[PDB]
PDB file of C-alpha atoms in Angstrom:
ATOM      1  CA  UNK W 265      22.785 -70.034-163.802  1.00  0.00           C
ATOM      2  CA  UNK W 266      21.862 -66.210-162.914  1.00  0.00           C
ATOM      3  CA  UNK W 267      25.365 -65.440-161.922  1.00  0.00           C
ATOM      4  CA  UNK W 268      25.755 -63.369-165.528  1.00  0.00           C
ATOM      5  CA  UNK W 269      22.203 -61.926-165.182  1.00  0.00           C
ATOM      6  CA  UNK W 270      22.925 -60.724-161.747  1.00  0.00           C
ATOM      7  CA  UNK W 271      26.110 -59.069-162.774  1.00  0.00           C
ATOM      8  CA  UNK W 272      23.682 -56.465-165.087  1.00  0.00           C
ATOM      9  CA  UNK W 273      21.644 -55.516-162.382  1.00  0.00           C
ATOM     10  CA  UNK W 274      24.476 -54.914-160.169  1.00  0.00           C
ATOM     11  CA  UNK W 275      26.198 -52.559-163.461  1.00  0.00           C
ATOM     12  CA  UNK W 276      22.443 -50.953-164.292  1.00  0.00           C
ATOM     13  CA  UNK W 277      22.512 -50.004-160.071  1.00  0.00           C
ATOM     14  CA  UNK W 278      25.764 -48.930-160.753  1.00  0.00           C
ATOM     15  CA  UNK W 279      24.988 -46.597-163.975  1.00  0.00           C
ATOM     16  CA  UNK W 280      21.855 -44.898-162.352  1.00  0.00           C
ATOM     17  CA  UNK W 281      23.792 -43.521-159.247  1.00  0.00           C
ATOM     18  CA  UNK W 282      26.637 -42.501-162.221  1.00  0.00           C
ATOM     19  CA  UNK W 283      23.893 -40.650-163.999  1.00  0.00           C
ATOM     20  CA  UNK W 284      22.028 -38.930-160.975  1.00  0.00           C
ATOM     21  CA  UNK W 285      25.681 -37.740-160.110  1.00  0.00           C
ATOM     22  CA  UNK W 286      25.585 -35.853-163.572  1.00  0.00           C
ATOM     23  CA  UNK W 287      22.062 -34.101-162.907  1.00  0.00           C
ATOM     24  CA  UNK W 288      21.093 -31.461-164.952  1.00  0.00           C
ATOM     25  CA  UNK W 289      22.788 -33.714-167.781  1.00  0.00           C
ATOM     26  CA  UNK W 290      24.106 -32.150-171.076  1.00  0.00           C
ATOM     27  CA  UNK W 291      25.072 -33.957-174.620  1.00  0.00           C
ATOM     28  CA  UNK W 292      27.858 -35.070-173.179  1.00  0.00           C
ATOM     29  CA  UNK W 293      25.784 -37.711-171.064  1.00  0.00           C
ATOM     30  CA  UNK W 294      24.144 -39.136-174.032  1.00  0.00           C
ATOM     31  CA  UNK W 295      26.350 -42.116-174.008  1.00  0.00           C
ATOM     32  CA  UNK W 296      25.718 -43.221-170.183  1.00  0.00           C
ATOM     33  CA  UNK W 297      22.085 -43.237-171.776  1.00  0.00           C
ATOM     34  CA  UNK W 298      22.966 -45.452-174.507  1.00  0.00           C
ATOM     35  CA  UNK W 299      24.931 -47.827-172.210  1.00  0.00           C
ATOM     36  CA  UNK W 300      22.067 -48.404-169.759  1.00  0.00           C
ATOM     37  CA  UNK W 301      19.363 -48.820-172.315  1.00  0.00           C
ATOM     38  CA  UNK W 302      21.622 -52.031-173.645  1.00  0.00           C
ATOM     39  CA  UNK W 303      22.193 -53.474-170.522  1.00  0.00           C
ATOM     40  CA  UNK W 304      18.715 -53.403-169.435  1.00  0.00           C
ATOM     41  CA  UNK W 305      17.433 -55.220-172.682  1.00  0.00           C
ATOM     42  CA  UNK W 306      20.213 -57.484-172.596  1.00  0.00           C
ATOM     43  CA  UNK W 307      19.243 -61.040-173.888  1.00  0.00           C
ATOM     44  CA  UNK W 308      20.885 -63.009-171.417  1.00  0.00           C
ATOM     45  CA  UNK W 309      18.993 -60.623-168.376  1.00  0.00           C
ATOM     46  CA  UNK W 310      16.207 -61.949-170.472  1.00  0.00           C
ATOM     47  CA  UNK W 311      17.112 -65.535-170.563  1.00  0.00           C
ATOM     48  CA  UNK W 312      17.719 -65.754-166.825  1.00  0.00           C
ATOM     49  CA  UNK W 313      14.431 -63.986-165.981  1.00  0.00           C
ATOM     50  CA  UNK W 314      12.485 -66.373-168.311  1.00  0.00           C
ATOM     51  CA  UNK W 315      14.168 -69.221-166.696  1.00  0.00           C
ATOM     52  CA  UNK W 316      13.539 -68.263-163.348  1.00  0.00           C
ATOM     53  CA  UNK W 317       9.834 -66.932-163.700  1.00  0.00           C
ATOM     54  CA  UNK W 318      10.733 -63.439-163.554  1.00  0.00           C
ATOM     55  CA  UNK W 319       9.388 -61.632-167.137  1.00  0.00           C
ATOM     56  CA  UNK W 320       6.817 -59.652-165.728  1.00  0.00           C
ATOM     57  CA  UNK W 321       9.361 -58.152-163.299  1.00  0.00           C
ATOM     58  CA  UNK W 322      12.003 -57.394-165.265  1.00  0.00           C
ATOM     59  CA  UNK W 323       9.723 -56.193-167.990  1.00  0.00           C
ATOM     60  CA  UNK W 324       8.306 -53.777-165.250  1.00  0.00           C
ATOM     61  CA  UNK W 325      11.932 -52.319-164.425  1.00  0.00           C
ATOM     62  CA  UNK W 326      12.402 -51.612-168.059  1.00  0.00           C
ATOM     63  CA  UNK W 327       9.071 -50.016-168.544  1.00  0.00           C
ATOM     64  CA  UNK W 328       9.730 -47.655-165.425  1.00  0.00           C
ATOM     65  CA  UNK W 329      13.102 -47.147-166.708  1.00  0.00           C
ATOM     66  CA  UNK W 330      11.751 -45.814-170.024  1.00  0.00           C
ATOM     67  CA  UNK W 331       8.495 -44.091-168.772  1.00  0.00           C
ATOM     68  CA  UNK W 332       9.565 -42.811-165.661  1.00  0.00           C
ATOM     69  CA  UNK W 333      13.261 -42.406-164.520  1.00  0.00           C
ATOM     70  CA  UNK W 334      14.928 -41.039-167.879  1.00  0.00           C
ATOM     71  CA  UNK W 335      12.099 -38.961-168.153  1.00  0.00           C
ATOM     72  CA  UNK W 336      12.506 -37.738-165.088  1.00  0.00           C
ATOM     73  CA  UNK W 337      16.089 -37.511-164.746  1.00  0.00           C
ATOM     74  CA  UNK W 338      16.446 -35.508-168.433  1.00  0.00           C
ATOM     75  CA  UNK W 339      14.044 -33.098-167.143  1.00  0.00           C
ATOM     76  CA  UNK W 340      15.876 -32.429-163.280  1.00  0.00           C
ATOM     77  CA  UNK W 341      17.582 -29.252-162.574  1.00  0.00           C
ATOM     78  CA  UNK W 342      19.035 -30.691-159.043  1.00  0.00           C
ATOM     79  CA  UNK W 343      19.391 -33.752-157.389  1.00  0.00           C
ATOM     80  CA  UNK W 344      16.186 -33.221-155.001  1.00  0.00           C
ATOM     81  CA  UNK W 345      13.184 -34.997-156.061  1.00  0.00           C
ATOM     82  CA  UNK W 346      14.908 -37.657-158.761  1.00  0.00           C
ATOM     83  CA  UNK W 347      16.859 -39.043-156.209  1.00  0.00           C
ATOM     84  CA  UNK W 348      14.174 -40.898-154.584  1.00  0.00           C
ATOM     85  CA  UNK W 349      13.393 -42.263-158.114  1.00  0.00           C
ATOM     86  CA  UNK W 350      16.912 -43.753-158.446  1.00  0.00           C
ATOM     87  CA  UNK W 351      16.448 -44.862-155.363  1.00  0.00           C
ATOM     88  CA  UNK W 352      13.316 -46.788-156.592  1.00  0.00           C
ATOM     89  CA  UNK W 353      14.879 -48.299-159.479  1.00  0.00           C
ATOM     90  CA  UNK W 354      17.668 -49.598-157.361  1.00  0.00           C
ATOM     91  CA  UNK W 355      15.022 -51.275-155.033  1.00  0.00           C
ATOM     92  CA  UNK W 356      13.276 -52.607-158.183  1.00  0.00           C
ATOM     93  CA  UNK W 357      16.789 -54.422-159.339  1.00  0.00           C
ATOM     94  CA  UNK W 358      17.323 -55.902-155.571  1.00  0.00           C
ATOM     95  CA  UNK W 359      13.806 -57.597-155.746  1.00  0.00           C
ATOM     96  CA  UNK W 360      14.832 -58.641-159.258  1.00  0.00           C
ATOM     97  CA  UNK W 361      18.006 -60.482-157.912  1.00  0.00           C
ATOM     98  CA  UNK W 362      16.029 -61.986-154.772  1.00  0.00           C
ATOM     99  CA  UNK W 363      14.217 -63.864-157.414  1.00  0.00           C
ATOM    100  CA  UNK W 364      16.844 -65.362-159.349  1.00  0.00           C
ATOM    101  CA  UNK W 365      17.553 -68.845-158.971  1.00  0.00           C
ATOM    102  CA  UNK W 366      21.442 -68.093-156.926  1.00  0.00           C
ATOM    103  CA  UNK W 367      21.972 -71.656-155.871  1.00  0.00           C
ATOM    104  CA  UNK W 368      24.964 -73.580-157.321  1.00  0.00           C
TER     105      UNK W 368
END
């Protein structure tokens, strides 16, 4: 019943290589912002974690998501040190989907 929820994390691993790929970002990337902060509170990534015993997790991706990697990628003039943050965050969202419940 994770099938939607695992969709998001594959489109939030999607939208953090999309916004690394626009580093130093400008006004014009405000939006991408916008888009990723939705699908990361999404109710239904919500549902599917509560479900499937994984709250703490997924709260702990957004909370690193807001405390660490926008921070972090608003502030970077190059792609050199907030790429292995990405790369983090991406890591983060495969454990996430190794925990949901995939089976029929």
């Amino acid at each position: 019943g994770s099938a939607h929820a695992i969709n998001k994390a594959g489109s939030l691993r999607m939208q953090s290589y999309r916004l690394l790929a626009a580093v130093p970002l400008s006004e014009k990337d405000k939006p991408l912002i916008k888009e990723m902060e939705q699908t990361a509170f999404s109710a239904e990534l919500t549902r599917a974690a509560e479900r499937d015993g994984q709250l703490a997790q997924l709260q702990g991706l957004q909370d690193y998501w807001r405390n660490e990697l926008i921070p972090a990628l608003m502030r970077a003039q190059n792609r050199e040190t907030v790429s292995a943050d990405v790369s983090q965050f991406v890591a983060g969202l495969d454990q996430l989907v190794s925990g949901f419940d995939r089976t029929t």
